[PDB]
């Protein structure tokens, strides 16, 4: 056991669940959040039967108050050392069929939410003097294809937040990273663990993984 | 001459004025747009003095209904052939001092507004079967520096919108372009004219200019 | 009215190169046009001269640094060298195990080495006049290396770096170094190079990508 | 042991030495090459006192015959499983001062040698049905600065070789990677160990590391 927490913002999918499993398996108390937090009960049982610690919460990440409360709670339980922001929103609409609602919603889910998760984690971590903030990217963080104006906009948006944060906070002992996924959920979790284990002398900001 | 309109969304600054001057000098009826639309009066004087046609309007680009009406007003006067989105927003705040309001407001001015201006320009131009949609970018569209989380996030976001639109609409005879600036505000207006003059067999999506 | 100036077109043997020569000659420059077999430039010379333009055709193997240097020195001696356009392609594809020592070396000599020498020697000549433009033709293989493209992409990436490094050094010294990436009509590429030529120093583009739709 | 060899081409610097020490400690038989192979004698003595296995050879990486013989020698000892190509050439000259001799020598040491190293490694590895081919890059692999025409040309060139080889060979079970440096040399060795440990479902092609 470590006297430390890991926040997994977006433990709904298999990737998010695997990240939770992995950091729990390594002795962190995992705070896991998804929209319908009752659906985390399978994951909790499995992790706790394996002897690991997890606090499951319902969380709409679009809501900045809930994100702040989620992260503050994690840090109150034990010092927050790692946040993994894992909130996707893969949608495709031709530009004319991209509504105001969809564009705003995707930004709120995939960019706005990551900004708030990143800022509030930084606030908690800088008080401890160390920490790691990891964001999940996609190929839409790198290039905007046809139909992906809403989605690529939010993912480019998140990438820029990660960059600016890294420029500011890497010199302040916070490892900001951006993992672009393009597999086993478990392989994504292993990749986050690999970023976690990097020493200060050789930190990677951006990594892309593909399955072969 | 000409029987067609140019919408210059962001005619408030020096760059926006010069673009309005340039496209009017080349025979287009320029629909200029800024916040305080009555501050366009010295520009409207100078342009009409030289024989150019200009319709000055108040415009808050964040408001999607105002943008839609602005672009519809331009098209109703003469077929809309060129939209140039040129909306500022250059701010710097450390991550912890980047407020909810700043982040959301910067996105609204610089990314959301660009998406609306773009999608609505596309609707109108596709009726005429041709047209050009140009977006002004910055170094912050390409990399996020320290303190630039809000601004870089929004410019990255605009880049992805421009990219996705280009992937879909360039095959449908609409030249979508993204002009990155690091000048003569007049030199920027010239660069846009270069992009306008390009034939369909040699269209550039992204062009970056800087002085020496 | 003739400009008292030359343009070196290194690689005037394809349609793109010929159109570049046609364009700069149409705008009043004397074009020095080089291809491996200079006698094959005879139709181009005839066409340019009948339209009122000036052109000197030479045989030039751009892998040969002595020939590149002599070609550029000759152009500058004629009239001040103002624009060099390096347009030496080489699109070839071989799986990695089938990419021979010969193919890899030759593609580098033609597409990268030749560009370095042309660039360096053009810079030497142009800096004496205090101005000039040095343009390099790139490809998508300048930006990413696909399967089978190890030799070609290596040389194109290599050319792009040379261009970047020359630009960082010489743009503040009044040389517009540029890199035009293509993937037409050939007349369109010439237009794009003319567009780059026309840019004022308050707004130069280093790299630009074009494609047809 | 691992009953396998690791070829370190460019073991004459501190980084090269550390890569050798690292893979030897993990039970590989390291084949270490540098221009004067007698200067590897201290490293051999250090690794072998620790219980590691290493063979030192003189190698001029510009010479394709020597590179091929080096890698054949490695594979003849035990299956070549990892090749790490690590031959730098960090020189700076203004363009007019970059001689024919310098531009060619730099390509020969830093690009040509890498190509031959990669092609020959792939030949040997494909016969065993697996392998990893790693290339050390620099910031000059990504952008060319003033004075770096020779170095950046060769480094860009090598990046491209790595890219093409990766596209072709990752589907055929060879992990090709490009580690961009910029720091302790042990940190570089650690990052290559990271890349070695990546499972097939989550391989990264390119990773940048820098110190903080």
Tokens of D116: 């031959």
Residue of A nearest to B158 (CA): A153
DSSP 8-class letter at B173:
T
Distance of CA C169 to the CA centre of its chain: 19
Secondary structure class of B56 (helix, strand, coil): strand
Non-local (6+) Cβ contacts of B36 within 8 A are: B12, B58
Tokens of A134: 């990891």
- Which residues face B84 on adjacent strands? B8, B134
Non-local (6+) Cβ contacts of B184 within 8 A are: B18, B190, B211, C200, C202, C203
Secondary structure class of C80 (helix, strand, coil): coil
Whole-number Cα distances in Å, B166 to A103, B132, B134, C37: 17, 10, 10, 41
Cα separation of D41 and D45, whole Å?
A: 6
Q: Are D193 and A202 in contact (CB under 8 A)?
A: no
Cα separation of A7 and A73, whole Å?
A: 10
Cα separation of A102 and A108, whole Å?
A: 10
Cα separation of A57 and C108, whole Å?
A: 59
Helix (H) or strand (E) run with residue B9 in it: strand B5-9
C35: phi then psi, degrees, rounded to nearest 5: -145, 165
D192 near C CB under 8 A: no
DSSP 8-class letter at C29:
P
Cα separation of C161 and C150, whole Å?
A: 16
Q: Which of B188, B202, B205 shows the shortest C-beta gap to C188?
A: B202
Q: Are A139 and A152 in contact (CB under 8 A)?
A: no
Secondary structure of chain A: what % helix, strand, coil (to 5)?
Answer: 55, 20, 25
Tokens of D33: 């090459």
Distance of CA A16 to the CA centre of its chain: 8
Q: Which of A183, A199, A210 shows the shortest C-beta gap to D190?
A: A199
Pinpoint the alpha helices (H) of chain D: 14-25, 41-49, 64-77, 100-107, 113-128, 149-169, 185-197
User: b/e map of A96-121 (b: 16 or more CB within 10 Å)?
Assistant: eebeeebbbbbbbbbbbbbbbbbbbb
B100 near A CB under 8 A: yes
Residue A80: which region, alpha, beta or left (left: phi > 0; alpha: psi -120 to 50)?
beta
Q: Are D122 and D169 in contact (CB under 8 A)?
A: yes
Tokens of B115: 């998406």
Method of determination used here:
X-ray
User: b/e map of A43-53 (b: 16 or more CB within 10 Å)?
Assistant: bbeebeeeebb
D31: phi then psi, degrees, rounded to nearest 5: -105, 115
C139 near D CB under 8 A: no
Secondary structure class of D71 (helix, strand, coil): helix
User: b/e map of C5-17 (b: 16 or more CB within 10 Å)?
Assistant: bbbbbbbbbeebb
Look at the block and give the residue holding tokens 């020969």: D108
Pinpoint the alpha helices (H) of chain C: 15-26, 42-50, 65-78, 101-108, 114-129, 150-170, 186-198
Within 8 A of D209 by CB-CB distance, chain A residues are 198, 202-204
Non-local (6+) Cβ contacts of A151 within 8 A are: A89, A90, A91, A92, A106, A110, A140
Look at the block and give the residue holding tokens 């009948």: C50
- D144 with C159: Cβ contact below 8 A: no
Q: How many CB pairs under 8 A join C and D?
A: 133
B183 near C CB under 8 A: yes
Q: Are B75 and B4 in contact (CB under 8 A)?
A: no
Please give the angle made by the CA atoms of C3, C7 and C8, to the nearest 5 degrees.
160
C125 near D CB under 8 A: no
What's B116-172 look like in SS3? HHHHHHHHHHHHHCCEEEEEEEEHHHCCCCCCCHHHHHHHHHHHHHHHHHHHHHHHH
Whole-number Cα distances in Å, C127 to B179, C73, C202: 30, 13, 19
- C185 with B201: Cβ contact below 8 A: yes
Cα separation of B139 and B115, whole Å?
A: 19
Whole-number Cα distances in Å, B130 to B25, B171, D29: 21, 11, 65
Distance of CA D95 to the CA centre of its chain: 28
Cα separation of D131 and D121, whole Å?
A: 8
Domain that holds residue B199: 1-212
Tokens of D107: 């390509």
Other beta carbons less than 10 A from residue B88's beta carbon: 17
Q: Are A95 and B122 in contact (CB under 8 A)?
A: yes
Please tell me the number of Cα atoms within 13 Å of B31 on its side-chain side.
27
Gap between the terminal Cα atoms of chain C? 36
Q: How many CB pairs under 8 A join A and B?
A: 133
Is cis: bond before A28, omega within 30 of 0? no
Secondary structure class of B142 (helix, strand, coil): coil
Q: Are C88 and C115 in contact (CB under 8 A)?
A: yes
Cα separation of D202 and A212, whole Å?
A: 8
Look at the block and give the residue holding tokens 């593609």: C107
- Which residues face D174 on adjacent strands? D131
Please tell me the number of Cα atoms within 13 Å of D75 on its side-chain side.
20
Q: Are A86 and A8 in contact (CB under 8 A)?
A: yes
Cα separation of B73 and B55, whole Å?
A: 10
Secondary structure class of D81 (helix, strand, coil): strand
Cα separation of B43 and A132, whole Å?
A: 51
CATH of the domain at D48: 3.40.50.720
Q: Which of A118, A122, A163 shows the shortest C-beta gap to B152?
A: A163
Please give the angle made by the CA atoms of D143, D147 and D153, to the nearest 5 degrees.
50
Whole-number Cα distances in Å, A105 to A139, A152, A182, B98, D116: 19, 13, 23, 21, 51
Within 8 A of B98 by CB-CB distance, chain A residues are 115, 119
Cα separation of B124 and B12, whole Å?
A: 24
Mutate to test the interface with D, among A201, A205, A211 (most CBs of D within 10 A): A201
Q: Are B195 and B132 in contact (CB under 8 A)?
A: yes
Number of domains comprising chain C: 1
Look at the block and give the residue holding tokens 């792939």: D122
Mutate to test the interface with D, among C164, C172, C177 (most CBs of D within 10 A): C164
Q: Are B93 and B102 in contact (CB under 8 A)?
A: yes
Non-local (6+) Cβ contacts of A181 within 8 A are: A15, A136, A137, A138, A188, A208, A209
Non-local (6+) Cβ contacts of C102 within 8 A are: none
Other beta carbons less than 10 A from residue A31's beta carbon: 27
* D34 class by beta-carbon count within 10 Å (0-12 exposed, 13-18 middle, 19+ buried): buried
CA-only gyration radius of chain B, Å:
16
Cα separation of A140 and D158, whole Å?
A: 27
- Which residues face C134 on adjacent strands? C84, C177
């Amino acid at each position: 056991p470590r006297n430390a927490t890991v926040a997994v913002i977006g433990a709904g999918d298999y990737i998010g669940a695997e990240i939770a499993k992995k950091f729990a398996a390594e002795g962190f108390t995992v705070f896991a959040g998804r929209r319908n937090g009752e659906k985390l009960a399978p994951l909790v049982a499995e992790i706790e039967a394996a002897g690991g610690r997890i606090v499951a919460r319902s969380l709409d990440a679009r809501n900045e108050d809930e994100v702040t409360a989620f992260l503050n709670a994690a840090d109150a339980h034990a010092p927050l050392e790692v946040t993994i922001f894992n909130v996707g929103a893969n949608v495709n609409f031709p530009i004319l069929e991209t509504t105001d609602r969809v564009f705003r919603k995707v930004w709120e889910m995939a960019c706005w939410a990551g900004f708030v998760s990143g800022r509030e984690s930084a606030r908690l971590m800088l008080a401890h003097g160390q920490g790691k903030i990891f964001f999940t990217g996609a190929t839409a963080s790198l290039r905007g294809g046809s139909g992906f104006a809403a989605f690529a906009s939010a993912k480019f948006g998140l990438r820029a937040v990660a960059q600016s944060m890294a420029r500011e906070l890497m010199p302040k002992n916070i490892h900001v990273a951006h993992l672009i996924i393009d597999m086993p959920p478990a392989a994504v979790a292993g990749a986050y663990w690999q970023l976690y284990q990097q020493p200060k002398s050789a930190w990677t900001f951006e990594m892309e993984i593909r399955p072969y």
